[PDB]
């Protein structure tokens, strides 16, 4: 944890980021629900089976 002063020169637009996702299967239409995403700039890899 750090504390730092500065001056702001650029600010991007407000966008949307997901924290809980749900995915569906092609054939049997089963679902995996309430998968928790990680905070910050981190992605997620879908399962294959």
């Amino acid at each position: 944890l750090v504390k730092i002063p500065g001056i702001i020169i650029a600010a991007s637009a407000v966008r949307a980021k997901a924290t809980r996702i749900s995915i569906q299967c092609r054939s049997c239409r089963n679902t995996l629900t309430n998968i928790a995403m990680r905070p910050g700039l981190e992605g997620y890899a879908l399962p294959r089976k």
Partner: protein, 193 residues
């Protein structure tokens, strides 16, 4: 494979069977039908189809849990934690095999000087024909003809082969027929002993 002898049987019990393993030079000996003493170790070997019901098993100490889409269900969870069934069986490894109670030149060389002295003393006795009859059958009264026949069958003849490819018997076969209680099975039991 070895089997427990009759003298060690308790009341109403079938003899116990055990597996013995021979490595390298000791492999040669211990032919079938022998009655031998073994000296070695008692060792545990795993088995497969012993447990029709779940029992003791192994696992890993790592505190690992599953993730959505890869949840540790039955088959995948068991394979991930490396679960193995602990089944075992008892096996004997032998390092020394001996007879329980112990090529004419080889036989002569095996015998010691005192044994050869005894053999030579036996050799030159005419009473060998008589005394062998009484020695093997001390309790049975009479029937000396049967005793002589059994001794002759025990010693046996000489086998030969001819030039045409035929073979000639060298063994002797004996049959006894008699009225009840004429010690008929005693000869069989004495020869077996």
């Amino acid at each position: 494979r070895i089997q427990e002898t009759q003298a060690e049987l308790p009341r109403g019990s079938i003899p116990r069977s055990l597996e013995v393993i021979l490595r390298a030079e000791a492999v040669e000996s211990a032919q079938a039908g022998d009655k031998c003493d073994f000296t070695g170790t008692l060792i545990v070997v795993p088995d497969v189809s012993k447990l029709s019901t779940p029992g003791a098993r192994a696992e890993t100490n790592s505190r690992v849990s599953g993730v959505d889409g890869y949840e540790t269900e039955g088959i995948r969870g068991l394979r991930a934690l490396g679960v193995r069934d602990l089944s075992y069986r008892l096996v004997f490894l032998a390092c020394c095999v001996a007879p329980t109670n112990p090529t004419a030149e080889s036989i002569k060389n095996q015998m010691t000087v005192k044994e050869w002295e005894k053999v030579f003393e036996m050799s030159q006795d005419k009473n060998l024909y008589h005394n062998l009859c009484t020695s093997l059958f001390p309790t049975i009264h009479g029937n000396d003809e049967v005793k002589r026949g059994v001794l002759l069958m025990l010693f046996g003849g000489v086998p030969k082969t001819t030039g045409e490819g035929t073979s000639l018997r060298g063994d002797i076969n004996v049959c006894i027929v008699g009225d009840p209680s004429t010690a008929k099975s005693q000869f069989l039991k004495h020869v077996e002993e």
